Amino acid sequence: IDYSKLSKEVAYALRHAPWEYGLELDAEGWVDINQLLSSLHESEKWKKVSEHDLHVMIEKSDKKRYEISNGKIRALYGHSIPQRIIKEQKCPPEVLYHGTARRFVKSIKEKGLQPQGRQYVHLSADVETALQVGKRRDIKPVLLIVNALEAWSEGIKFYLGNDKVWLADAIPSKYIRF
Ligand SMILES: Nc1ncnc2c1ncn2[C@@H]1O[C@H](COP(=O)(O)OP(=O)(O)OC[C@H]2O[C@H](OP(=O)(O)O)[C@H](O)[C@@H]2O)[C@@H](O)[C@H]1O
């Protein structure tokens, strides 16, 4: 089992297109794990995949993308579906980070950080994690430093993703150090 490719398939089902797998996510993103497995088994590549394989995929991952609880599974962040995933509001640390591509910096300066295709702006707890986010689009990514606690004190909402991935509503440029 190629766990990296399996994770990409699971991400598509749990973040982007659950309907394509015949799945319906609840308000917090959960779906029955046997329903996900049944849907994965529609694809020739994944007919061997067991629940055990999903736990191992999670255990071996660089990132805490998914969690399995009481026979249900969800993605913790990254969703793009029309129905807003309900996340817990959370006061952020003083500073969070956002790694991006050079070609987006002018637009972020003018408009702030926007959720774009996702439901939430995604932020990083540390510099190295943020640079890895930016490296997905740019070999020379730009580190943005977000005055997150200041933004929160002025009404910008932040939400729990995981220990390394923070979520937010749109963040005005005034809170972003370039
Ligand atoms: N006003 C504006 N004008 C122009 N561009 C703007 C803009 N505001 C923001 N942008 C940029 O628009 C891109 C959005 O791109 P994305 O939706 O992929 O967000 P992201 O890059 O944060 O990545 C999410 C997670 O996906 C991966 O997680 P996984 O590995 O899949 O688990 C990562 O690790 C993350 O945690 C980003 O470049 C923004 O900088």
Residue numbers in the entry: 4 to 181
Task: Quote the passages of the study that discuss this structure, keeping the authors' original sentences.
Tpt1 is a fascinating enzyme that transfers an internal RNA 2′-monophosphate (2′-PO4) to NAD+ to form a 2′-OH RNA and ADP-ribose-1″,2″-cyclic phosphate. The Tpt1 mechanism comprises two chemical steps in which: (i) the RNA 2′-PO4 reacts with NAD+ to expel nicotinamide and form a 2′-phospho-ADP-ribosylated RNA intermediate; and (ii) transesterification of the ADP-ribose 2′′-OH to the RNA 2′-PO4 displaces the RNA 2′-OH and generates ADP-ribose-1″,2″-cyclic phosphate. We succeeded in growing crystals of Tpt1 from the mesothermophilic bacterium Clostridium thermocellum (Cth) using recombinant CthTpt1 produced in E. coli. Hexagonal CthTpt1 crystals were in space group P6122 and diffracted X-rays to 1.4 Å resolution. The refined Tpt1 structure (Rwork/Rfree 16.16/18.57) comprised a continuous polypeptide from Leu3 to Glu182, consisting of nine β strands, six α helices, and four 310 helices, organized into two distinct lobes spanning amino acids 1–85 and 86–182, respectively.
The Cys46 residue of CthTpt1, to which CoA is attached, is conspicuously not conserved in other Tpt1 homologs, thereby underscoring the serendipity of covalent capture of CoA bound to CthTpt1. To explore this point, we mutated Cys46 to serine, produced Tpt1-C46S in E. coli, crystallized the C46S mutant, and determined its structure at 1.6 Å resolution. The Tpt1-C46S structure was notable for the following: (i) its tertiary structure was virtually identical to that of wild-type Tpt1; (ii) ADP-ribose-1″-phosphate was bound to the NAD+ lobe; and (iii) CoA was absent from the RNA lobe.
